[PDB]
Design a protein around this ligand. Structure first.
Ligand code: V2M
Ligand code: V2M
Ligand code: NA
Ligand code: NA
Ligand code: NA
Ligand code: NA
Ligand code: NA
Ligand code: NA
Ligand code: NA
Ligand code: NA
Lengths: 305, 302
């Protein structure tokens, strides 16, 4: 038993982390087969990042201006191309540690493991949730750009995040592996503001199902609701509206407990209107929203990869 | 910036995880060189686990009785010994992915990364702290025995925990890699309670320093207390006493933020007597004690 914030085993990703350097600007890159993926601002100087023209800056760069290092071993760059905010560097060596992988763009509220890296060497791993305002409440310092976020499904690593910047509020923003930023952020050295964040309702409901599975079910009421009525009420409490996919991925937890999804929504609605009344759920007085229904199922079922 | 519960990269340990089966009992094993380390209760049956005479049960087992599998491959057991609660199975093949390693016994309050595994396959990784009552608050289910805890320094993996048991209260207990249990627990199928769980005081203070570094200051006050006066109140709330060693270890955090330790102690004292009301610290509604001063410095130095 027990419920902890669990990251995926990071071994398959550790073997793909390299260092990328242009002049004196250095960050992390992702080495899959014979291609290294990294943030495009590696080609910028400190002053270039203030107001960069990436098309102009890249046209002056040649393959021999890129230093890619797996540890201390250099991988010669034999080709380069820009795709949105990510630089793709073809190298002379196919990574023998390349796992089965996919490039995926995740939804807000979906979780993933972040392998924090500095100078191409992994330093730590932890689980993040993509906030509804497309930020992540991570832990990133200088030199962490290029660190990737990922999920593992069986033998396949689904890469979903690459780190680019830290907002003034201390949260973090980045792109998918195709270089498309999550949310309305740009890769420039400017103070950028994120939208008003909200609570991930599908994850709170999954956490409620996890409590019911563990015998903590005092919050179950005799009410039900429609999905539209609940979505309108939830927004008044700064909670995210539920999608059809949200109801679908809550299916297994609903079947395992016998509690209909819309019944759990009405129970959560009462918890928002009247509070907890000095009671706790799973030992916590706060409603946790960084556990997806997959995270609840994966943890309680001992799923391996 | 930012502060999060983070674990070491587990790749060096994933290459050592194997599956050990004896009879109808299956758990995880740690494959280092030509030795596989796993909990010794894998040799027990349902009736044995009640009151197992391990010396008597082990002598009655042969090499062929143990099925060790590393991924697809089956490792041939060519020898078997036992050190306390850890069974040692010698195999005819050395693990090529064996990293630089060492077996260490950590102290209460220190942290380590847990690679939770099932049937020899890694499932997840998270950070745990060795609580003062020598239990850990982890997430282990059936088949997780043999999962190990560790710390990594440079290229060396320092193994410090192997999982054995979940107490009725939901917390977990295990041994070091020499088979010695952390706490007064025994590897038998009985309901066992631990001593009173106190709070790691030096860790709460470091966590409060991390909150100040990250812009959380609402809990601070203008007051200062003495070391003894704080420990009097701390022990009243089942907090571990704060030693001058702990005060010195918090030094870099105190100098970086400009808040003296004794100043932070006065803030913690107010939090214990008045509570947190409805506010939170670093997103938590409770006083966290599973972050060491090193965990805070290593994450908030810049
Ligand atoms: C990368 O490591 C650089 O390669 C770096 C990671 C952040 C820095 C510290 N912690 C992090 O997460 N990313 C940056 O430095 C980026 C630079 C590119 C152009 C995106 N910039 C920021 O993260 C940034 C800039 C500013 C700013 O200006 C002025 C004002 C306020 C906040 C801010 N964040
Ligand atoms: C291992 O996976 C078994 O190899 C298992 C790990 C626990 C299972 C559930 N969650 C875990 O962390 N370990 C055990 O099952 C051990 C067995 C060995 C012999 C110690 N037993 C317990 O953890 C246990 C037994 C009892 C009990 O009896 C009766 C009564 C109440 C609680 C309890 N926990
Ligand atoms: Na609005
Ligand atoms: Na009960
Ligand atoms: Na209405
Ligand atoms: Na309201
Ligand atoms: Na939307
Ligand atoms: Na049911
Ligand atoms: Na022999
Ligand atoms: Na012999």
């Amino acid at each position: 038993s027990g419920f902890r914030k669990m990251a995926f085993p990071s071994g398959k990703v550790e073997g793909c982390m390299v260092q990328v350097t242009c002049g004196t600007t250095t960050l992390n890159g992702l080495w899959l087969d014979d291609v290294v993926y990294c943030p495009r601002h590696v080609i910028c100087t400190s002053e270039d990042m203030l107001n960069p023209n990436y098309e102009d800056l890249l046209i002056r760069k040649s393959n021999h201006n890129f230093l890619v290092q797996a540890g201390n071993v250099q991988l010669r760059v034999i080709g380069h191309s820009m795709q949105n905010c990510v630089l793709k560097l073809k190298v002379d060596t196919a990574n023998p540690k390349t796992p089965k992988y996919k490039f995926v763009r995740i939804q807000p509220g979906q979780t993933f493991s972040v392998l924090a890296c500095y100078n191409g060497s992994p330093s730590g791993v932890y689980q993040c949730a993509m906030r509804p305002n497309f930020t992540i409440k991570g832990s990133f310092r200088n030199g962490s750009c290029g660190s990737v976020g990922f999920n593992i499904d069986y033998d396949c690593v689904s890469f979903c995040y690459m780190h680019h910047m830290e907002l003034p509020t201390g949260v973090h923003a980045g792109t998918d592996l195709e270089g498309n930023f999550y949310g309305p952020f740009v890769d420039r050295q400017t103070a950028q503001a994120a939208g008003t964040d909200t609570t991930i309702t599908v994850n709170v409901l999954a956490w409620l199902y996890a409590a019911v599975i563990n015998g903590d079910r005092w919050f179950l009421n005799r009410f039900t609701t429609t999905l539209n009525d609940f979505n309108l009420v939830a927004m008044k409490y700064n909670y995210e509206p539920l999608t059809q996919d949200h109801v679908d991925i809550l299916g297994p937890l609903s079947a395992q407990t016998g509690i209909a999804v819309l019944d759990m929504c009405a129970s959560l609605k009462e918890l928002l209107q009247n509070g907890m009344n000095g009671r706790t759920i799973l030992g916590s007085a706060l409603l946790e929203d960084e556990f997806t229904p997959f995270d609840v199922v994966r943890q309680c079922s001992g799923v391996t990869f």
